Amino acid sequence: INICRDNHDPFYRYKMPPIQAKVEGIKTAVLNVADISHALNRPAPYIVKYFGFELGAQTSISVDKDRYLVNGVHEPAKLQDVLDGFINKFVLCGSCKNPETEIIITKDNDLVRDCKACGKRTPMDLRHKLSSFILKNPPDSVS
Amino acid sequence: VGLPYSELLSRFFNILRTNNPEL
Amino acid sequence: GETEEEKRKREFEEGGGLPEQPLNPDFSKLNPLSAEIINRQATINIGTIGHVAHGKSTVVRAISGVQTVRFKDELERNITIKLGYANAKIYKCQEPTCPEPDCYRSFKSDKEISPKCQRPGCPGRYKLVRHVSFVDCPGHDILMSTMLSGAAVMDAALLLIAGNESCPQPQTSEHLAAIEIMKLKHVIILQNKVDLMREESALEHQKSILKFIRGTIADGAPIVPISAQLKYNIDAVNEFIVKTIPVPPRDFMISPRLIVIRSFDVNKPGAEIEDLKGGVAGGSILNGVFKLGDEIEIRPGIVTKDDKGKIQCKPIFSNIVSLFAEQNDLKFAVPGGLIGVGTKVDPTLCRADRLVGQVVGAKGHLPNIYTDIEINYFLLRRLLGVKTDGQKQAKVRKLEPNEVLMVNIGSTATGARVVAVKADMARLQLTSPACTEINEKIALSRRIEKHWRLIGWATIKKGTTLEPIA
Amino acid sequence: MRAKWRKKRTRRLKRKRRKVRARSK
RNA sequence: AGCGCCGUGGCGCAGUGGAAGCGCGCAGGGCUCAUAACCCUGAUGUCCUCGGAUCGAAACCGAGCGGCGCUACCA
Ligand SMILES: Nc1nc2c(ncn2[C@@H]2O[C@H](COP(=O)(O)OP(=O)(O)CP(=O)(O)O)[C@@H](O)[C@H]2O)c(=O)[nH]1
Ligand SMILES: [Mg+2]
Ligand SMILES: [Zn+2]
């Protein structure tokens, strides 16, 4: 089980489980999106749609029933690396690189990474498609 | 004084070599 | 052609069995070593301390044979919150022809007065020198109040250290220093891991341990290499316990009291409640000769807040229905041993960690609850339990006004607010009740690195008492 | 192609570099 | 220690009083010069182990097994 990162080899830190893929006809259902979602304080749609954003292919999302289908032939390494891009761009904060940061909207629609240990409001890369995705669905309140 | 510690220590080592010769 | 069970019953009968305690004996003549007392209660409390993930309970089960539950699904593996209770009987064998080191034999609570000698070829019978109780204190960094309560109820200590691990384990140092705080200088150092060890490595670790204990209060503490899983060097620890640890002065002149650390509701589920029992509070009598059918009151007891915000305490009077000690229900209780005081108390009152560190007094004495207490405090130079990666173990800062501090008076885990800090005294306000009986050694812990950190010791000097509402 | 969208993309990239300046200054 | 849930063909749900259910799976065929979409046809199974009720019980019930959601460490 991953230590929640890729180019990071500690023995003590917050945990993430790897995600995998099963075949449908073709589109791969990813089993382990809700658990990583809870391990990163970030809803599963952000995981799936970010994977799509770095991927560039049609995708299907259904959170109520666990059938997360992403279309394409992607070996474990490719999607785990795209999710690594997710966690580095999104999950981990600046100073300590905390693998639990939430996504918060202030009175301005500044979608921002917010942490707990360092607790800063990390200046978010709003210049990404997942920023618009997250702003479309406010977290834990529109899902 | 820990002299009565090493006697039990050697006793344990002797039983170790008695019971588990492969170790 | 006899079954093992029929056999055991036979040598239990031949050993004298477990005689019933008398209803009313001559208490002015009884000692904690009278045959009447040793067979059905523990007179010496022994605690076990060590680093986390070490196996303190494993040595306990090797010595006695009674498990420590290890409950709550989550706590079945990681760490438990309450203490660990097990009963051991120290059986010496009367035949001097057999070697002294293997003479001693520790058995479960269910053993007889004189069971046969297991050593092949010896016709001797064991004589029970003393029945002792064992308290397995936690070994983690968050659970600290329960450890200090166990130390307060401890009469003897057992330090456990592993060999191949890093030599300076700070959890062990914190345990030993806390034991030093609460007036315990009877400690037996135990080397748990000796089987996976080299001849030179064991000597180097022994030298390291001896160098470690040079500047602390305890000087002449024995060290014994024991194996928790291999179940050996059990007699050696028992003979060390018999030799080095005498009986602390605890006679019947001192007024009766109780200090409850654990609670036990008695609500056996599934059956009709028309056959039900009371509720048991696990408490230690550090002083007092309690019997069956006596009036008692929990001094801090019911805690309530009125509309104005004032904290009201209703002492929980109760009639003792039974006292449970050792294995059999006993008529009168011996101080110096954990006892389940089973009373008519409410089932919910003893449900959770509710009677954890509270003070109880029999009818005929009035311990005083206090709201503001003047303490006399002393403190060390560096915190223990902080692994500094090569830099000057964190030096402790002086206390400040308006700071939340975990103050363990005796066994009570209370959060005090500082009203005044001085050179050697301080003033504490308790939002949670505490009571003052006589001296009641205190420990102080701060919030410095997330979790609790012991800093020093204190003694109650003055206080503002709260008169209980009748 | 659709020079409509190319011009709009250039405007958006200029907007993003301007906002990166705005945070950075 | 007790109560509420469940018992798959490879997976999610369902009717459980006429006895193996669909989607999605898959092997194969159809269509297209070709691929997919689609169209269709087929293959795996002891609705858990054993009884009562019934013409017949996977199914109504039960005399229990395996696993779960609470009470909560319950002398
Ligand atoms: N190698 C070795 N392992 C032991 C020994 N004794 C116990 N263990 C192992 O320690 C592990 C944990 O034992 P446990 O008693 O639950 O630890 P604990 O002391 O209760 C945890 P804490 O120190 O915080 O109180 C067990 O798996 C056990 O096999 C020993 O003597 N040698
Ligand atoms: Mg324990
Ligand atoms: Zn951060």
Coordinates of C-alpha atoms and ligand atoms in Angstrom, one line a residue, chain C residues 56-57 68 70 80-85 135-138, ligand 2:
Chain C
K56 CA 4.4 -5.9 29.3
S57 CA 1.2 -8.0 29.5
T68 CA -5.5 -8.8 30.6
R70 CA -7.1 -6.4 25.7
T80 CA -5.6 -0.4 26.0
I81 CA -6.8 2.5 28.2
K82 CA -7.6 0.9 31.5
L83 CA -5.1 -1.0 33.6
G84 CA -4.2 -4.7 33.4
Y85 CA -5.2 -6.8 36.4
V135 CA -1.2 -3.8 37.4
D136 CA -0.2 -3.4 33.7
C137 CA 0.1 0.3 33.1
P138 CA -0.2 1.6 29.6
Ligands
MG2 MG -2.4 -3.1 29.8

